[PDB]
A paper describes a structure:
The mycobacterial PS is made of two proteins, bδ and b′.
These structural elements form three separate domains. Then, bδH4 to bδH8 form a separate domain, named the “linking domain,” which is attached to bδH9 in the third domain, named “the δ-domain,” consisting of bδH9 to bδH16. Therefore, the δ- and linking domains appear to have arisen by a process that involves a gene duplication event at some point during evolution. Thus, the bδ-subunit has two structurally related domains and each binds to the N-terminal region of an α-subunit (subunits α2 and α3) in a similar fashion with the third α-subunit attached by a different mode.
Residue numbers in the entry:
A (entry chain A): 5 to 37, 42 to 52, 54 to 66, 68 to 75, 82 to 96, 111 to 118, 120 to 125
B (entry chain B): 5 to 22, 30 to 37, 42 to 50, 69 to 75, 86 to 90
C (entry chain C): 5 to 23, 44 to 50, 69 to 74
D (entry chain E): 8 to 16, 19 to 30, 53 to 64, 74 to 81
E (entry chain D): 7 to 15, 20 to 31, 55 to 64, 74 to 81
F (entry chain F): 11 to 14, 22 to 26, 58 to 62, 75 to 77
G (entry chain d): 109 to 444
H (entry chain b): 130 to 166
The structure:
Amino acid sequence: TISAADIEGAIEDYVSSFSADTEREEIGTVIDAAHVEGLPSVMTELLEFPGGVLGVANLDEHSVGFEKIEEGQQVKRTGEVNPLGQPIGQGDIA
Amino acid sequence: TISAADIEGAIEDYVSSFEIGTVIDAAHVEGLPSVLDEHSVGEEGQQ
Amino acid sequence: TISAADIEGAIEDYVSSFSVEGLPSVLDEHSV
Amino acid sequence: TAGRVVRITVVDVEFPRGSVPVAQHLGDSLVRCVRGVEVTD
Amino acid sequence: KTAGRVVRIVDVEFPRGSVPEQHLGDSLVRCVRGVEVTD
Amino acid sequence: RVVRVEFPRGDSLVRGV
Amino acid sequence: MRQQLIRQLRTGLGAEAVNKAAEIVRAHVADPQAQSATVDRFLSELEQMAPSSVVIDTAATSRLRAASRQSLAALVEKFDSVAGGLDADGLTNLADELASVAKLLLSETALNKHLAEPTDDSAPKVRLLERLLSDKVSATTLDLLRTAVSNRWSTESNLIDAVEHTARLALLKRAEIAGEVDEVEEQLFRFGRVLDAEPRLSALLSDYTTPAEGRVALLDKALTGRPGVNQTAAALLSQTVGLLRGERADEAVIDLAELAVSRRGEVVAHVSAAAELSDAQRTRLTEVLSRIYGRPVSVQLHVDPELLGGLSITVGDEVIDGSIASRLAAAQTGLP
Amino acid sequence: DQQLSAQGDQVRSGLESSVDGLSAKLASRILGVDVNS
């Protein structure tokens, strides 16, 4: 009794509602690995590394305290089941 | 360019100009040369 | 108005020109 | 006349030259009580 | 080029952007001084 | 002289006397 | 397996749809007019962006501590007061003298240590300076040095850094007097770009173990000594490479360019565009960036093909990412 | 699961038609302007 209508509806709802609003975002750079320079206004915080990797911001005047992470990569600040809460493959969790 | 070797004497006068120590850490006191290493002697800014 | 060939030639010419501390050909950038 | 957090781990704060108040005096106007947030004596 | 050289004996330095995929910063990685190294 | 010893020529740093 | 079956079907359908969306995006972007339209749309979006709350972007010399930063502010104010009447040749002499004094201080570690140690009174420092080099430098140079040493510096190295800064300011001022500030800005940015493109050359130039004269000669023979190089930019770059203490050559050139633009009061904005912009587009971008950041901004273009459209601006530690490629990546990762 | 597999294959084959439309819509969102293709 697979409702092909449901399968179509999920994806069309995702596509139609898709939105990625550009935002003024503060970035740092990995200096070694993984210390991050920059991110002047990071909280004592969840950071995003390329490939969607997640890290946790040890703050010093110099620098802040799994896909490949390399020196020079750009690190973004988020401004805020594996321990992250992501399911690990029954599907997304509301 | 410019070069000089007699500067060695000149600096002496400057250091010869000045004993009072000043607290830098807390406690370490800089100064008191004739009184514990080169940097300092084993509230900040106090004399 | 810059040619990479000129840069390569100049740097190679200079490298030829000027070519426990010391012992470079003997362990880190400072000393053995 | 107000400090500003410098290191966070034990918060190393930095104050103006004459306004140093705070569990230690690291020297160079730093005491050891988001970086850069102002701290009042 | 894009090939590194041995700095410390091993800490190997690479040109910027050529760092092989422990990174010590300043384009160095940890894996005779100055010998040619390739990745 | 003594620093903590200083001699004319690590760096010879092997007060004021 | 039921819910797993729906999950598999949704995953396959979404993957195929997003792959075709990427294909369509790349096909549409093929047209340069499409690139222009995307840039215009992103600019339109920028006009709606709220002005930055942190009007203090600074970051030109953020590495300086509060004490040394204030001392350098006083020193640059004194230099600005002094240089008003000085002539172009006088400015060149001042810059050369300051560079020589900076290298002298760097060589003589003890002298710099003594002359940079903070103290309540400065008269001994002034006397030491005068005895050392009262005659070897002009009156303006000696006044600048005495003002510099009168203040306090967090670290002895900050003193030589400040002297180098003053030399750079003198060179920039003589460039300004001739009315060639924009030309020297462009030349400095181009030199930074080429140094970045040739990391081997920068690394060779970015060592202080070798004699400074040799590195300056290399710079002249390779990059600086060319028919089209502006004289002021040549002198500034040669002086900077001569006085290197572990800073990367490309980083030093970028810092020089940033300081040059700062003197005008502007701020450098590194806009990475998919393709070249139009004059109207450039003016609109400058206006929107200036109003949002609250300060006039000089825009540096870095044409990058894989951006695929839009722009990617960066000022200080802040980045505004309008690249179409970023949208495609988000769509790829945004699947349920 | 053979019957479930049969429904899965049949339904994915059937949905292979409308999929194109979705792609276009998605493009329109990331291009920011409607794309007819």
